[PDB]
Design a protein around this ligand. Structure first.
Ligand SMILES: [Cl-]
Length: 160
């Protein structure tokens, strides 16, 4: 009940993985305002050079329930379309979550991709991970994912 809580998800995309990996990982801070300008106000690198160790800050628009998030890149293997990164700060963590650790892995399937993401919610000591909260966060994450995919399909030159 006070353990970390992990979900794994796999889905195929018609988008080629080099584009999806830039949009969803490496340059996500530069795409999220373009793909979801009704949710995200800004995305920027606040520390680092783009690679391992980089911290990004994403802020939400006014009127959104959330305010900002900081993520750090832990591991990047761009040739294999793999990244581990950690959401380590922000109001979305509320009081009970220490960090959320993400692993993304894509591979080419014909002209598109197969993607796998693992998400691990780490509660603070003496706290628990609330499943309804995870469900709502994951629904919203899945909306972002699908709207990035719809943006890349509508704008085929981007990251091509
Ligand atoms: Cl600032």
């Amino acid at each position: 009940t006070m353990a970390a809580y992990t979900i794994v998800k796999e889905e195929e995309s018609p988008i080629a993985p080099h584009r999806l990996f830039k949009a969803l990982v490496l340059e996500r801070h530069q795409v999220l305002v373009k793909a979801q300008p009704h949710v995200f106000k800004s995305g920027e690198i606040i520390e680092g050079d783009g690679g391992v160790g980089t911290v990004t800050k994403i802020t939400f628009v006014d009127g959104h329930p959330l305010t900002y998030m900081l993520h750090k890149f832990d591991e990047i293997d761009a040739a294999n379309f793999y990244c581990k990164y950690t959401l380590f700060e922000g109001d979305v963590l509320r009081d009970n979550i220490e960090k959320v650790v993400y692993e993304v892995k894509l591979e080419a399937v014909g002209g598109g991709s197969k993607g796998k993401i693992t998400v691990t919610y780490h509660p603070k000591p003496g706290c628990t991970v609330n499943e309804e909260e995870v469900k709502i966060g994951e629904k919203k994450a899945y909306e972002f994912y699908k709207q990035v995919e719809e943006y890349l399909a509508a704008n085929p030159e981007v990251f091509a």
